[PDB]
Amino acid sequence: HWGYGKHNGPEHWHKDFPIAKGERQSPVDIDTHTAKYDPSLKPLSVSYDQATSLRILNNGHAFNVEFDDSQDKAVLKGGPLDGTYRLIQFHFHWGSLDGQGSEHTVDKKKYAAELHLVHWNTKYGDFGKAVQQPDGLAVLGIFLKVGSAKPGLQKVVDVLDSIKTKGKSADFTNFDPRGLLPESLDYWTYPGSLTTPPLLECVTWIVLKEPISVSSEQVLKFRKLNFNGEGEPEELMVDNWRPAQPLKNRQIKASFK
Ligand SMILES: [Zn+2]
């Protein structure tokens, strides 16, 4: 099955998922000097005050914090979006070393990790219908650099020992995702895809310019997770990131100048 090793990694995915070579694949390198400032873009509206987290789960390629998405509780609006997008989960991509780990890059610069908050368009009724549509998903991407600790991340870091192996899940209630956001909400946006199989081209990417800082100790704990299931040989969950894909016929827009 697909993964991030030498024999099943991203360079192999096209054999099972031929859209891997499609026209709007993600991630991409953000060239800050060719991105177009678009003054018609609106500020992002992030309404997470009523967010209800439920569970944290190791799915064999990352860990997902899942939210109750049966009502408009935690929603993303504005920016380049039409309509209302509900938060369903967030997860991260990270490296084996501090110098790599993000999926998107900025002027070819790699960050130590990348946070993805995944939202789906309410007009489509459920997540599974949203993935089939070109405007079905909105993913907020936030870079992580190593520096000072992020206090609002620590609750996540402390529970990772209970979900070390694939298929492990733990109750994870009352987590506030507002603790993960940077000060500024300036962003780049472009139309893209999921960055894991099935790689569907259903995503409006919204990548924040300002990274958040996490401590060396916090990212170290990410790297103690396991791709494998319990009772299988240990393969550390590191470098679960897809390399940048060709931009092709797309334009990256910026909310700022
Ligand atoms: Zn992701």
- Give the distance (Å) from ligand 1 centre to CA of residue 42: 24
To the question of whether residue 196 is assigned a binding role by annotation, the answer is yes
In which domain, by residue range, is 38 found?
Answer: 1-257
The DSSP secondary structure of 138-205, one letter per residue, reads: EEEEEEEEESS--GGGHHHHHHGGGG-STT-EEE--S--GGGG--S---EEEEEE--SSTT--S-EEE
Could you give the 3-state DSSP secondary structure of residue 49? coil
| C-alpha–C-alpha distance, residues 197 and 193, integer Å | 10
Reported resolution, Å: 1.8
Tell which residue, 50, 122, 125, has the closest CA to residue 86.
122
Exposed e or buried b per residue across 179-215, where buried means at least 16 C-beta atoms within 10 angstroms of its C-beta: ebbeeebebbbbbbbbbbbebbbbbbbbbbbebbebb
Is 138:203 a contact under the CB 8 Å cutoff?
yes
| C-alpha–C-alpha distance, residues 137 and 80, integer Å | 12
Q: Torsion over CA of 128, 134, 138 and 139, rounded to 10 degrees?
A: 90
To the question of whether residue 91 is assigned a binding role by annotation, the answer is yes
Q: Furthest-apart CA pair in the chain: how many Å?
A: 55
To the question of whether residue 204 is assigned a binding role by annotation, the answer is no
Rg of the chain on CA atoms, in Å: 17
Angstrom CA distances, 42 to 176, 191, 252, 255, stand at 25, 16, 15, 8
Is 167:237 a contact under the CB 8 Å cutoff?
no
Tell which residue, 240, 251, 97, has the closest CA to residue 189.
251
Residue labelled with tokens 């060709």: 246
The two structure tokens encoding residue 236 = 């550390």
- DSSP structural state of residue 43: P
- DSSP structural state of residue 221: H
Is 164:153 a contact under the CB 8 Å cutoff?
no
The count of domains in the chain is 1
CATH of the domain at 5: 3.10.200.10
Is 177:48 a contact under the CB 8 Å cutoff?
yes
Given 1, 7, 33, 61, the catalytic residue: 61
- Give the distance (Å) from ligand 1 centre to CA of residue 9: 15
Task: Tell me if residue 61 is catalytic.
Answer: yes
- Give the distance (Å) from ligand 1 centre to CA of residue 141: 8
| C-alpha–C-alpha distance, residues 120 and 13, integer Å | 24
The two structure tokens encoding residue 131 = 């993935």
- Give the distance (Å) from ligand 1 centre to CA of residue 37: 25
Q: Which method was it determined by?
A: X-ray
